[PDB]
Scaffold this motif. Structure first.
Motif, short mmCIF file in Angstrom:
data_model
loop_
_atom_site.label_atom_id
_atom_site.label_comp_id
_atom_site.label_asym_id
_atom_site.label_seq_id
_atom_site.Cartn_x
_atom_site.Cartn_y
_atom_site.Cartn_z
N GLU A 244 -0.91 5.21 6.20
CA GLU A 244 -0.95 5.35 4.75
C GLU A 244 -2.21 4.70 4.16
OE1 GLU A 244 2.70 4.61 2.02
OE2 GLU A 244 2.09 6.70 2.26
N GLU A 245 -2.61 3.55 4.71
CA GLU A 245 -3.79 2.86 4.21
C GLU A 245 -5.05 3.70 4.40
OE1 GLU A 245 -5.84 -1.29 5.50
OE2 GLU A 245 -3.79 -1.43 4.72
N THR B 118 -0.84 4.98 -5.51
CA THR B 118 -2.26 4.98 -5.89
C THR B 118 -2.61 6.25 -6.64
OG1 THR B 118 -2.91 3.54 -4.07
CG2 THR B 118 -4.62 4.90 -5.04
N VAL B 119 -2.06 7.40 -6.22
CA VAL B 119 -2.32 8.65 -6.93
C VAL B 119 -1.77 8.59 -8.36
CG1 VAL B 119 -1.67 11.11 -7.04
CG2 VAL B 119 -2.53 10.07 -4.87
N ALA C 144 -5.06 6.97 4.56
CA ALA C 144 -4.91 8.08 3.62
C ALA C 144 -5.37 7.68 2.22
CB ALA C 144 -3.45 8.56 3.58
N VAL C 145 -5.01 6.47 1.77
CA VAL C 145 -5.47 6.01 0.46
C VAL C 145 -6.98 5.84 0.45
CG1 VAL C 145 -3.23 4.85 0.18
CG2 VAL C 145 -5.23 3.49 0.63
N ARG C 146 -7.55 5.29 1.53
CA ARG C 146 -9.00 5.17 1.63
C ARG C 146 -9.69 6.52 1.51
NH1 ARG C 146 -13.48 5.27 4.79
NH2 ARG C 146 -12.36 6.69 6.24
N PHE D 130 -8.46 9.27 0.09
CA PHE D 130 -8.29 9.72 -1.29
C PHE D 130 -9.38 9.13 -2.18
CE2 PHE D 130 -6.19 8.73 -5.51
CZ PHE D 130 -6.19 9.96 -6.03
N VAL E 56 0.83 -1.21 0.00
CA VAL E 56 0.00 0.00 0.00
C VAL E 56 0.87 1.27 0.00
CG1 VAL E 56 -1.69 -1.36 1.34
CG2 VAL E 56 -0.32 0.39 2.53
N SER E 57 0.56 2.21 -0.89
CA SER E 57 1.34 3.44 -0.97
C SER E 57 0.45 4.52 -1.55
CB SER E 57 2.59 3.26 -1.85
OG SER E 57 2.99 4.49 -2.44
N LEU E 58 0.37 5.66 -0.86
CA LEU E 58 -0.51 6.71 -1.34
C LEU E 58 0.01 7.28 -2.65
CD1 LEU E 58 -2.89 8.74 -0.89
CD2 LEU E 58 -1.15 10.26 0.13
N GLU F 19 -14.24 -1.97 -1.07
CA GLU F 19 -13.34 -2.76 -0.26
C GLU F 19 -14.11 -3.57 0.81
OE1 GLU F 19 -9.03 -2.09 1.91
OE2 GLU F 19 -10.70 -0.67 2.19
N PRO G 163 -6.71 0.13 -4.87
CA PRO G 163 -5.71 -0.78 -4.28
C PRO G 163 -6.20 -2.21 -4.20
CG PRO G 163 -5.75 1.27 -3.06
CD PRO G 163 -6.93 1.32 -4.03
N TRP G 164 -7.52 -2.42 -4.08
CA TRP G 164 -8.11 -3.74 -3.96
C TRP G 164 -8.71 -4.22 -5.27
CZ3 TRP G 164 -9.43 0.68 -1.30
CH2 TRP G 164 -10.59 1.35 -1.76
#
Lengths: 98, 36
Positions: free
Chosen positions: B14-15, A6-7, B17-19, B21, A1-3, A98, A60-61
């Motif tokens: 981070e997880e 994903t962006v 934060a992605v959620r 987003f 997982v990495s922001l 998710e 991500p999923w």
């Protein structure tokens, strides 16, 4: 997982949508207009039918929902279905959750 | 947040934060002019 990852995948998905939006051939005279709604890429819609697109691949999923589609409905007026008090058209994205 | 300071903390964070987003995207966030 990495922001950041994903962006970047989202930027890539947006870019592929912008390619389709500009490059796909025009549709009949009446259809709901193709669009990118920041979450999913929508093609032109046939009046009176649901419109399906695959769950967006930047999620991500995404690999846990490999057969999931998200939906809009294109009314017989050629307008995406949308409640008067909503700024976004109706969308069902329950298959991509998710 | 009791019991939060785990090695897993930085990733759990981070997880989320992605959620958030993704939630923002579902709200049309990148192009929205709506009042905050």
């Amino acid at each position: 997982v990495s922001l950041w990852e994903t962006v970047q995948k989202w930027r890539e998905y947006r870019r592929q949508c912008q390619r389709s939006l500009t490059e796909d051939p025009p549709p009949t005279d009446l259809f709901c207009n193709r669009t990118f709604d920041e979450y999913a890429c929508w093609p032109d819609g046939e009046p009176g039918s649901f419109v399906n697109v695959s769950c967006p691949w930047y999620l991500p999923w995404a690999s846990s929902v490999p057969q999931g589609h998200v939906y809009r409905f294109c009314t017989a007026e050629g307008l995406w279905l949308q409640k008067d008090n909503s700024s976004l058209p109706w969308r069902d994205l329950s298959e991509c959750e998710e | 947040x009791e019991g939060x300071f785990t090695s897993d903390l930085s990733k759990q964070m981070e997880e989320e934060a992605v959620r958030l987003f993704i939630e923002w995207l579902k709200n049309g966030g990148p192009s929205s002019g709506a009042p905050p």
